[PDB]
């Protein structure tokens, strides 16, 4: 009885991936108007985004992350990242300042990881000028809500150990745990990897 287990899990993922607007029931999360911001938030599949929006999101990711990727074991390759960001399974939360200028986004997916239904956050990226205003925390709280409303078991993400601000944001401010799949949770002599996998159960 091993296919029955993954079938219940994959059914829930497949259903979430057929949703229209995962935030339709939650209009209060479509605005963030604190600390000088006036943002409107939308949740769309990548197929619903304009090409210039995808370009902005890729460029913001590259600006913020390219050096940190090269400092890691992964490296940075434009094509690999663009293909990941434009996969048909990609979902986006996009924050538009004054409903007009894109200033932040998350790329997330409903997927199976280690036999569990999860919401995987593949990116959370803010322009520098909108940081330390609570917007990133709010976007992650939206992800947590969507994980609950679709019956996922956790929100998961990867963070570089050398991305010290993001590590403190997730681990301390948002109290994500180190996931059992993280490299640090294998081996009893302190292995050496440059990222951690973090998660927060629903």
């Amino acid at each position: 009885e091993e296919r029955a287990a993954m079938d219940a899990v994959c059914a829930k993922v497949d259903a979430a991936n057929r949703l229209g607007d995962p935030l339709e029931a939650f209009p209060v999360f479509k605005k963030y108007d604190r600390n000088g911001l006036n943002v409107s938030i939308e949740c769309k599949r990548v197929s619903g985004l304009e090409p210039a929006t995808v370009d902005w999101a890729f460029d913001l990711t590259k600006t913020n992350m390219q050096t940190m990727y090269e400092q890691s074991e992964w490296g940075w390759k434009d094509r690999e990242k663009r293909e990941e960001m434009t996969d048909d399974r990609a979902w986006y939360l996009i924050a538009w300042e004054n409903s007009s200028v894109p200033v932040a986004f998350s790329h997330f997916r409903f997927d199976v990881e280690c036999g569990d239904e999860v919401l995987y956050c593949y990116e959370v990226q803010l322009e520098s000028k909108v940081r330390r205003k609570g917007l990133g925390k709010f976007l992650i709280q939206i992800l947590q809500l969507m994980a609950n409303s679709t019956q996922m078991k956790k929100v998961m993400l990867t963070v570089f150990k050398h991305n010290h601000g993001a590590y403190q944001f997730f681990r301390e401010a948002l109290q994500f745990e180190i996931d059992d799949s993280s490299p640090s949770m294998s081996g009893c002599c302190g292995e050496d990897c440059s990222y951690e996998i973090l998660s927060r159960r629903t």
């Binding site: 990711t61 992350m65 940190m68 990727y69 992964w74 990941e84 995987y120 593949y122 990116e123 959370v124 990226q125 993400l157 990867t158 963070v159 570089f160 991305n163 799949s181 490299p183 990222y195 996998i197």
Partner: peptide, 5 residues
């Protein structure tokens, strides 16, 4: 960012 193993 990204999806590690």
């Amino acid at each position: 960012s990204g999806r590690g193993k």
